[PDB]
Design a protein around this ligand. Sequence first.
Ligand SMILES: CCN(CC)CCNC(=O)CSc1nc(N)c2c3c(sc2n1)CCC3
Ligand SMILES: CCN(CC)CCNC(=O)CSc1nc(N)c2c3c(sc2n1)CCC3
Ligand SMILES: CCN(CC)CCNC(=O)CSc1nc(N)c2c3c(sc2n1)CCC3
Ligand SMILES: CCN(CC)CCNC(=O)CSc1nc(N)c2c3c(sc2n1)CCC3
Lengths: 396, 396, 396, 396
Amino acid sequence: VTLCSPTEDDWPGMFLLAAASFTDFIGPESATAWRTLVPTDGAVVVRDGSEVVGMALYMDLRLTVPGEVVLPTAGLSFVAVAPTHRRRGLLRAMCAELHRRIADSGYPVAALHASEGGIYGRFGYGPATTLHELTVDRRFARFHADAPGGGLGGSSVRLVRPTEHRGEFEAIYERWRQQVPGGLLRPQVLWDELLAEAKAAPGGDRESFALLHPDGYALYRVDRTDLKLARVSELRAVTADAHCALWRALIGLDSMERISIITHPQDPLPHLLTDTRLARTTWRQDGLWLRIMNVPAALEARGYAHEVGEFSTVLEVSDGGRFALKIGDGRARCTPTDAAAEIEMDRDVLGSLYLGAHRASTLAAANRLRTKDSQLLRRLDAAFASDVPVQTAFEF
Amino acid sequence: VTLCSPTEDDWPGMFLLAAASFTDFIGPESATAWRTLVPTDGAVVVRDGSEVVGMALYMDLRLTVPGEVVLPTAGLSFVAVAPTHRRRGLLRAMCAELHRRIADSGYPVAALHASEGGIYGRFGYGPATTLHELTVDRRFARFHADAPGGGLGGSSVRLVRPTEHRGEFEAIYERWRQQVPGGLLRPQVLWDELLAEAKAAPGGDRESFALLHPDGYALYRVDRTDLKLARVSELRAVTADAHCALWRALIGLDSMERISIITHPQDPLPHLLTDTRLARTTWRQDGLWLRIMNVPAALEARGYAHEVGEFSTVLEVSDGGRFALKIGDGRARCTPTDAAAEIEMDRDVLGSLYLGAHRASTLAAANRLRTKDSQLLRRLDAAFASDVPVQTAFEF
Amino acid sequence: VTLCSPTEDDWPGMFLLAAASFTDFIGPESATAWRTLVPTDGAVVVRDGSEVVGMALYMDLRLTVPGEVVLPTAGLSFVAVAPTHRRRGLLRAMCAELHRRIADSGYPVAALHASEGGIYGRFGYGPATTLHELTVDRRFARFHADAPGGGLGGSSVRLVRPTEHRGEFEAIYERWRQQVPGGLLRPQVLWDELLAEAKAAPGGDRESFALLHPDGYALYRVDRTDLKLARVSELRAVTADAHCALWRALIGLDSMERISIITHPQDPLPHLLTDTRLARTTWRQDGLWLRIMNVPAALEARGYAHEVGEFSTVLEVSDGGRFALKIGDGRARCTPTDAAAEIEMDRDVLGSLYLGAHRASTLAAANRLRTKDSQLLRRLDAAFASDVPVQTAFEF
Amino acid sequence: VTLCSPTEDDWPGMFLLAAASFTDFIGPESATAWRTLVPTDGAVVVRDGSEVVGMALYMDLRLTVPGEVVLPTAGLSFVAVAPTHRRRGLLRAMCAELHRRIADSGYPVAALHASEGGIYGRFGYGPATTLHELTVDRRFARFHADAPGGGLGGSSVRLVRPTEHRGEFEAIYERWRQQVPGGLLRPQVLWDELLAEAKAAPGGDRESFALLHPDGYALYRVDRTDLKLARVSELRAVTADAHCALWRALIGLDSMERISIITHPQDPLPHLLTDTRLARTTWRQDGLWLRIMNVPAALEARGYAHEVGEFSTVLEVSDGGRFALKIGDGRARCTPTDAAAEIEMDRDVLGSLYLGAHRASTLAAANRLRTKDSQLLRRLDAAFASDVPVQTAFEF
Ligand SMILES: CCN(CC)CCNC(=O)CSc1nc(N)c2c3c(sc2n1)CCC3
Ligand SMILES: CCN(CC)CCNC(=O)CSc1nc(N)c2c3c(sc2n1)CCC3
Ligand SMILES: CCN(CC)CCNC(=O)CSc1nc(N)c2c3c(sc2n1)CCC3
Ligand SMILES: CCN(CC)CCNC(=O)CSc1nc(N)c2c3c(sc2n1)CCC3
């Protein structure tokens, strides 16, 4: 039970463990594409004296954080231990080895999507974004008088085949991801993959359609079994106009009873309708999880609310260092210190605060974040909050 | 079809319309108690030339708003039109008459709980608070190391009959409602009613139990049909310690699979667990709706974030006046003006912003709130936000 | 947190804990009756410095074991720890104290019905009987030619009110319980209770009917919600004739689609039908659990298969002693010894073997029962097996 | 309507009737393989004056019976009458003709798997084995301290592709089938078929995985629609160690909530867990059915319990002869006689007793098995019982 970087010869065994450990696995032809995003020495395997009984890897990603700042981000993925080798600390060992490599390569943050809500807290990952399913009974949906694009003349939205308008979707996603906290650069090979799932599969998913605006798009397909439900796989909009116009078109799908979409808690859709309640929240879950690899590098890299005045403090991260934090003009300076700590928190808590998804007040109430000064808590809340609301890019 | 204040002789007819129009109706013996909270000339009826084909009334309530300020609040309730008299503008006429009386009696705000999400926007009511059902699979629930009250020695929580500890529940609710935006004064007669629903009914709801802390309580009963689900009808806690201690006890109900509770979006419960995801959000809805009756009186009455610096502007409410708004030191001055408007919004939008439940950014994205300056939008967001998270008191 | 016998003053607090800890609780008026079966010093409570945070008790029962031998049996029941006092070893302490008293009072065995399948193994209780739900689609049910009582002339079964034929039900149950392993003496006060549940409750269970034979009875009621299902609460029959005759009558309920009954794995009903499969097994669970308090006293007290020849061995019970076991002529002699052990098992395993419900072969395969000689295993299997099939009397 | 052996020209018509009469039909490409196991003159068809309106056939099988004795067994299969020709005695005629051929070819027993529980009793077939679905909530499953292979060091179980380890599965199944009552020889062509269903089908079943031990294997796949359920299609284990080790691995499938398997009533899995009840019995059905073709040949061929002493009797089978049965030393001598019968039974009853699945006591209680001496009944029970528990090999 030794812990090595995989050879080319090791990948068939990894794909076997993958098939057994993840049901959503596409298969080796699709993995070719994602593999391209794994750097050299971005993967560890655990052989038994053989076959693969444990694997982890990271991908080179570009995460947009508050202040339209883009960080290089190690995306952890393809983590699996064989059912034959559970409770043997193979996960503790593999994660520890990748976190060493991620740190020494100079990534300030790591990120992942959790398959359980209880595994990842103990390795310093905090839930940083919130998925939020809205389901619209579109039979009752009337737009408010105040809603944009509710006059005479033509629609600016077209119904199209996704495959014939790849260029426009790329353009729009690129604009979107650069100005939205949680945004990820989506490389060429993941657009190849997104548009191979647009085509209908025999006895599988149905044909995907696109609504295309100059400044937005929405990919949607009808559900496999429930033929009165349209699922909106992806809606990107750079302007309120684009967002409203796309939803007028989705509400216009008169052969459907319901439109479902996985979106963020601040999605404005409910306020576009005469009746807010027609957009029922049916489902809610942690989205992207962040581990802050270098605290000073990460805290300094992002923007903060201009609205709160300049203020200073000492932050202590359990087994992560202690820092003089000074925040004014929406910039931060984070420097070493041995001065008495004013705030303590575990590294995962910092991960949750970082994209402005979770308020310090809330985490403090749970005693996940200790301080003795509530004015300092009001100020963290206010500073760390994101002007633009935080969103989940794509699963990896 | 004339519109009058009801005589004593009119109430039997109102109770008939009530029984037909509301399924959740307790019956005339229970109405005695709520009636006490309706002022003289707080009720209108519509007779047919007879019988009652339309009624509305308001109750005298005390709503806690940001800055621990308590406003006198007209609570609209018992609104019904006979099925025999629909689409006859009886609602438009009754609401218009009560809103006159509410305004002339000097109530700064009115409030209600909506039976549909689409009726109340057009009369100037905005959804001001958010209900949020959490359901815990308590079989998997382990508390985090950081959670308060997880050591040796005794528990501070007792299991009790609700009826024998009315005094303590009152004390605690009184403390809670005075420091929490959305808090309502609960008069003697509504505690009589709350504790008459604590006792098991033949072929109805099961016996209610209470967990009592020095600084918190939780009323709970097992579900009628689903005997592995406990419903938490009410949990009030004045301290993080009380809140944690009460949830340790609820998770300790080892004969249950699930605990459900209707709570607020900032409930810290999820952060108390090793696995945030065990506390699934199963349901979400508008709670309390506010109509701002006097804009200057209401805007001036509440507190604002100290964290944002002093700033000025002109707010225009559609058919509600135009005001020079000046906000600094968490106080506001709101005075008449004919100066060019910087912000426009309908009166319902103001209602939604007022308790800090909804961000101006979000309502602006839906074009429910027009401005041409996004720095002013950042500032409204920041000012109107509530330090203490907004909660829903009780239904009326 | 001290551990005492309850005063009369302590019972209200126990009834409160009961209501909170058991949903199936009838209420204090019904407890009067069961209380009569609890000896003096048969109950322990745990007060907090007060109120009751923990209780256990045993009842004086008479368990019929193989060889129509009747043992005095401590029936453990009413075991509860407050949700406010979990994981505090109150259960470990209460069970340890009752087991001392049960042992010193000279009970050879203790018994209980488990609310979870995982709590009771560690205190030396083994599942000793198996409940088995049969559900008959009675529309397709035709009796075999070989089935008794399928000729001309009159039926010997009558449809009656249970309350007017208490005497006959008692007579028959008394006959049944004396000749059937798992049989319990049912005292006067538990017949009072059984016949108070026969009468229909407002918005609860429906009226119970009885089919009465000279040598059998069946109590049945139609299900609350599913009106095409009859539930057979209890069927006792002393003769194959009685059993067949009662089932002809139940299959004769032509307004029902399904008859369900909770019975034992050897119930002959399936073999009475032309189609065995019409009697689907829908549910299966451990019934009665036994803890063997005195190994020599219990092993010596029961009968064994005459069919296996005389044979000897050394049995070792973990922390329960080591015994020279000699079995011939369906009697056993069990005497102390320090000779090398041939069979080892934990005390719960012995409990499972004792009424002949579980084969040693099976428990050996799970390594719950160690031996190095498989001829000795064949012999235990054969000896401990019950000629008459083991059944579950009533829940306590 | 004549009754002939099929020509090569008749098989297309049989395949048509097959497709219409059996939904689980694979299609003619798969039938090539099973056809190989049908002897010459093992099939009858009924033409209409044409097309095929009725078919039956038998396959040459090798059934393992108690005493590790292997009998040649006619496996009846592919029995169908056209919907156009029901209630015309085509089944009575076809079965009668095959039973003549099966008898004259010198097969001592015939076997089948029933599509209804009520058709096959009247042709002398008795349910001989019991299928038993266990479903494990594997989230709560902890193994007992007594369970084998729960120490440090390596696992002996590997996760593999089934297709690359055919040899090992064959070896293990061969060992298993020779020592287990109900065991069937599985020829080369049925391993070809088993491993063609291991591969995922488009819009059908998912990829099958194997857990391989030196002395056991388990084939499993995730359910089509329910993605949190793993179905265990086949688990063969020659040692308790193999069985425990394979289940540790299945419980180790951490992405599943439930493991279901179709197994036998004596499966030791429940006793391997700290909580027996986590292994719920969800489903139960007759498995293999036996018709005893030659009573003396079959009764003499199998082994009997050594534990019961030598004893004699006269058995009478309705329209099947009368025999002096003498049983001692686990051998039987069965010779003709006209002496007064002590036991009577129909031929199906004998089929049920033969593999030791059903106790004579039970069938006697249903009057399916008449005797006037209950000591003789105790002795049949004890003799016919199988030391090794009876299992169901594969469906045909
Ligand atoms: C629940 C687990 N999942 C399935 C893995 C997580 C991924 N969940 C997704 O939604 C995206 S599908 C996907 N994602 C990848 N990162 C990859 C990678 C491949 S192959 C692939 N496939 C080889 C290199 C890394
Ligand atoms: C969906 C409609 N509902 C039922 C009315 C709304 C009230 N919804 C509740 O949850 C509280 S029950 C209640 N509430 C009242 N305000 C009152 C009042 C009575 S009688 C009563 N009863 C006479 C004077 C006013
Ligand atoms: C799941 C828990 N259950 C409810 C207790 C177990 C009992 N389960 C039953 O089915 C019988 S109802 C019953 N049984 C009793 N032994 C008793 C006793 C009372 S009151 C009563 N009531 C006071 C003295 C002991
Ligand atoms: C419910 C009916 N079934 C479908 C037939 C029973 C068989 N049930 C099974 O599970 C095995 S699939 C199978 N079995 C066969 N014996 C055969 C045979 C073929 S083709 C085939 N296919 C030609 C010669 C005999």
